[PDB]
């Protein structure tokens with residue numbers, strides 16, 4: 362039903378490697394993003410399993426599936442995000458100019474997309490800035506390109522991947538936004554992280570970040586997954602942040 | 617007259633910050649739990665002078681004051697904090713319409729006294745309402761909230777008890793939406809222009825039409841067409857018998 366011929370697609374510029382992700386034109390008018398599969402690395406039935414997930418999910422804050430190519434090489438066609446990954450965006454030229462009102466709005470958009478995933482009873486399992494795509498007018502959309510520092514302890518240790526383990530990951534994503542794409546738990550290795558978070562270690566409040574936003578991060582990092590907040594609460598809290606939580610917020614040198 | 621030495625009060629835990637000072641939880645004479653508030657000294661002490669004249673059960677009661685700088689305005693302690701934080705927090709999901717209407721009835725009672733005393737609050741909203749034990753709500757003042765202010769008070773500075781009624785209508789949306797910011801998606805600029813052309817917030821989800829009609833009565837273009845807090849108090853106290861006798865609890869209200 363979602364099938365289209367290869368003749369309609371024209372791969373123009375390569376964006377990432379691993380298969381690989383391209384920027385092209387569908388039917389010679391619509392600018393699209395094409396994720397190709399390198400044969401041998403993964404079977405076509407296992408690669409199209411991701412598109413099966415995208416067929417059931419439809420929201421303004423999720424990367425929208427456009428079409429699929431069942432003939433090898435396998436193509437998964439989606440909408441094009443002009444600014445790339447949130448991680449590269451935060452690390453790049455734009456990072457210096459982004460302040461807390463922009464970063465909280467981006468966080469509110471991600472929380473909205475994840476609030477849909479919550480309602481649909483789906484689990485992302487790899488929520489991070491690298492899996493968030495940025496477009497025009499600071500539009501952020503939840504994606505998956507295919508991460509112990511971002512994974513909840515029960516999910517990393519006992520494989521208990523839930524929407525509450527995604528909430529934990531969203532808490533880590535908040536540190537990425539407030540540190541301008543810096544890797545969580547700086548100086549700590551994957552083994553050091555897993556053992557310290559069990560003993561109750563949590564990342565301290567990032568510099569220039571208000572305590573109220575770090576409290577929200579700490580709510581996302583509660584040992585008991587059931588005690589963690591919903592993405593519905595996170596969306597509402599982040600949308601209303603500069604009126605209800607920080608009305609006396611003053612811009613600084615970085616945040 | 618209300619004066620007490622500095623050695624009596626002890627500031628233990630910081631509750632709030634910003635504005636002119638800070639709200640602190642402490643102990644007065646080492647027996648009773650109190651709240652202490654740390655602009656010219658004559659301007660800050662003027663707030664405590666107003667509190668000396670206002671005495672009501674649904675108003676934060678003034679206990680003591682320190683005249684010389686640094687000034688310490690001592691009041692009663694509200695264990696649950698601001699109504700906004702209370703609604704936004706863990707308690708929000710459990711609060712239904714009978715509780716929220718009872719809370720609104722208590723705020724209307726406090727504001728009914730304010731009305732009788734010919735006083736104007738000027739900043740009535742959930743952030744200036746404090747919650748205690750057994751859902752006791754008391755009117756407070758922590759010191760622009762255009763979304764809560766009436767058009768005549770925002771544009772022409774015509775601050776009255778009728779403009780406080782407008783603010784109470786917005787507070788009713790805060791209660792029924794569980795602390796959500798009014799006029800969602802709208803900025804203070806497009807709020808003033810839309811409200812002037814006649815725009816009013818629609819009925820919140822699961823909220824009865826009868827409570828939205830009361831919100832709209834508080835939001836009448838002509839301030840003298842707005843109801844009294846005495847009417848608002850009586851309407852909310854009798855709500856589940858006179859207005860909604862066949863009310864059934866839902867998923868959120």
Ligand SMILES: Cc1nc(Nc2ncc(C(=O)Nc3cccc(NC(=O)c4cccc(C(F)(F)F)c4)c3)s2)cc(N2CCN(CCO)CC2)n1
Nearest residue numbers: 376377394396423424437439441442443444445503504505
């Ligand atoms: C790597 C990259 N991608 C860019 N844009 C993209 N737009 C869409 C992309 C993409 O990954 N599309 C795609 C293709 C196939 C499948 C998928 N699926 C998903 O991402 C996916 C999978 C499962 C679930 C979900 C969801 F929504 F639930 F969370 C999503 C997504 S990648 C731009 C860019 N830029 C850097 C280069 N500059 C300059 C020009 O070269 C432009 C910005 N760099």
Ligand SMILES: Cc1nc(Nc2ncc(C(=O)Nc3cccc(NC(=O)c4cccc(C(F)(F)F)c4)c3)s2)cc(N2CCN(CCO)CC2)n1
Nearest residue numbers: 631632651653675676689691693694695696697755756757
């Ligand atoms: C900010 C905050 N205040 C709390 N409790 C409070 N109780 C009283 C407070 C207070 O503002 N007291 C105070 C001190 C000095 C002056 C004033 N005055 C007024 O508020 C005032 C001034 C003028 C007029 C009016 C009136 F009534 F007409 F409207 C009122 C009030 S603040 C608790 C709390 N929390 C609840 C639990 N804790 C942790 C417990 O360990 C965290 C949050 N958070």
